[model samples]
Target chain A: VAKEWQENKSWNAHFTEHKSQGVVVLWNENKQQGFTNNLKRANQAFLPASTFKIPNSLIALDLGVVKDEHQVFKWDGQTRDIATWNRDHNLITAMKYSVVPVYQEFARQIGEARMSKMLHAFDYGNEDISGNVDSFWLDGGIRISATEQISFLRKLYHNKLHVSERSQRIVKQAMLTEANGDYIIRAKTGTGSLSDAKGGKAKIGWWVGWVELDDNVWFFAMNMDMPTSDGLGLRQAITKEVLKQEKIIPF
Target chain B: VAKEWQENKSWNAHFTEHKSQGVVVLWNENKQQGFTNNLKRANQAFLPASTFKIPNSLIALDLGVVKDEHQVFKWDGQTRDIATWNRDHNLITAMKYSVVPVYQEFARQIGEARMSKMLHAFDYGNEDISGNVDSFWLDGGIRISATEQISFLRKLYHNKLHVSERSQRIVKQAMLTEANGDYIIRAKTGTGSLSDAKGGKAKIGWWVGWVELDDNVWFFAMNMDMPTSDGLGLRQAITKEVLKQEKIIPF
Candidate 1:
């Protein structure tokens, strides 16, 4: 059963200090409990942006659209603002650098029918990949809330997703961006644009991942409205602040 | 750091009652502790027999010798003693039936060089794939102890194996033979002939797999001498007996 979340007042400061409206959902699996700030926003869904890479990699591997982590996707000889995307990349390097062009190619190869089949199998947010297959998670109709992100992560962590275990494990491995003797963190970052109630558009930043300590696993997802491009740092900064304050990681 | 295992005297009766010499190693991941019966035999290396299918599947998938679980291998048109092996089999069905000929084809395709590379990466057995690549684990030099099996499983459970995570996860999934609402059992069974100390032949039976409970995971490997062909049932009977006595499953 999906239980109601208990709001953590301490986490509110992390968002308030950033001067942005956002939500953070931290769930402890063993305890069957979660802590969230702004439960309302936590329940509201937004475009997954690059965060969909997690599921994309899983579907591609499961279907054999791409091979293992080592299969290279050659660069199209095109340059982009992000310098890393300009070169050839395998699955691991592509995920590490969030090489959008490579993933877009992967999506195109996966095709709309297979992509929709897998998205439904994954029970991914909204299960709607209605627009261009390459840009569905970015500018298309797909969206996922912070709480739903936690649910998806929990399934991936427990190897309960409908995809093959290999696909889930490989994606989890790709998410490992930080590790040390005390703890290991596997996570992903996402950014996209969202239209606000007004005629103006707002930038959105997302940091979603999990922490593995000695005895427990903590799954967290945070997304905030970015007032400016400079607000990007707040994604990690605010999430890390709460994780440290909760002592999930060393200060 | 390898912690010393705690011998669980309670499990001894299971072996004694069957009048068969055997060893069982049960390790709890979250507690970082274990319970065992006969630590000496637990550390003694023996032929892996069909139990090699676990790592075999991992290596095959990693190297792309076979596709995902869905690719079928056509039977060689020769009937086998096991009725199930006579028909076509994919990775999942072959693992389910322990079809030796199917895996033999996989090993032959992997070849000795690539097989040795992955064995070293997995830290599997003795890291020796000497003799025919297809028969190494069964009749050649490959051997692994009950404790070593636990160590290998630990790495797999944590996705810490050197092989690609997808390969590990797919192999793990292939090992799943049974599941219920309260727990899931992912395991394999093996049987082989071993030359006794006196140069006489003896039959050996093995049951190796992990139990997933809501709060913890229990990895167990039990191998017993089979005095007669009928002793085949004891492989699972004895292991299940211990699991039940330990409350890992309902009595």
Candidate 2:
């Protein structure tokens, strides 16, 4: 896994090669046997970026705050600024399309306190956002670890986690696509970074999901960081390579 | 938290004073953390009793192996032997009540491979039971730590851990009661023992749920090991006291 990640030559390469820099990886072939590099630091919190939506969706469903997966809410296709396009979208559609504005509105409706409660319930990594739901995306983002990511995925597969069955099925179904014969690949991708340097031009990419083949189910969570915003393609390629090497999908 | 737990003495005291030969309480009062104690020698894996049912429900939901949480299935309500009472039940009812025969039959239908996969997805704490679903209540049994309990609860809240929101909510709702005002409480109780020693028995109690007061949600996961079977009163008292101390519930 490390070698494959290193060879990708993505922006994540900068951090991976510099062990002195605090970057971590927790790898497990199966549940019982796994190893961690910078395990302690790996536990440190980092911005969840779009990844926060995963738990947000679940919490909304569990709380009955959202009616159902099919329940649609329209988006008014108007942007606050002329730079970006404003379009109409609904909960499921927004999620499937990764519409940031729509989610921002939904988060506002859900309210900060409710959102904070959900984030706490999900145990957002270590970094504290003060449970501010509204500011979560704009000012304070959520945090998470690869290990926690895996743990969350396990509960998702087990149906022991809190949420509506319809919502869970809807989220999972929306994530799924036919990667191969009789095999379904379900995943969510997130990319974002602080706009601090070069007018805030950094990039982060995440791919978290599971594969169902025959009777066995395997899940994974991975992210890549790059120095350039244009390296998004490299991040996606690294994600694809890792999935291929793990035999989660065909190369 | 420790002070609150001590004051509520019903459950903690019963476990320490009556069942456990020795009890250790680790808590943070100022921070409003709860109390926890180890089970000692009796901690050896025994039949999970009904606790394993949580994972069973998860597997069925994840594979789409089962359909509709409200859908009902019939059981003969008569067992082959007098001790085995075959009872007709649905997935929802079986989980809500923690029925053994229902889970046993479901386990049989799911078979070992599917069960193993589901358990793996949840990161079953015990390697001995990872792929041995056929063992059922007897097969190695399930093992966990207080920390693992919290992780499981977080997953449930996030709805990222399981496939069936309805099943998860139904089970959690059944296990919970309103501690005070709108503060919701959910929990599971287990009773079993090791057979090797002279009159050696074990009792376990769990409370995993969240308090949704207005928009501030507080999620909690707790477990206790003791000798006697009934600890609900004590558990409730402890939970109530902690929530109050933490200011999670109104005085």
Fraction of true inter-chain Cα contacts (below 8 Å) kept per model?
Answer: 0.09, 0.05
Task: Report clashes for each candidate as comma-separated counts.
Answer: 1, 29
Interface C-alpha RMSD, model 2: 19.5
What's candidate 2's DockQ score? 0.03
Which residue window of length 10 is worst by lDDT in model 2 chain A? A2-11
lDDT of each: 0.81, 0.52
The per-model DockQ list reads 0.05, 0.03
TM-score of chain A by itself in each prediction: 0.95, 0.74
TM-score of each: 0.54, 0.44
The TM-score, computed over Cα atoms with residue i paired to residue i, of candidate 1 is: 0.54
Which has the greatest TM-score? 1
Q: For candidate 1, lDDT tens digit of each residue in B82-135?
A: 998998877867887889999999899998888899889889878888778889
Q: Indicate which candidate wins on lDDT.
A: 1
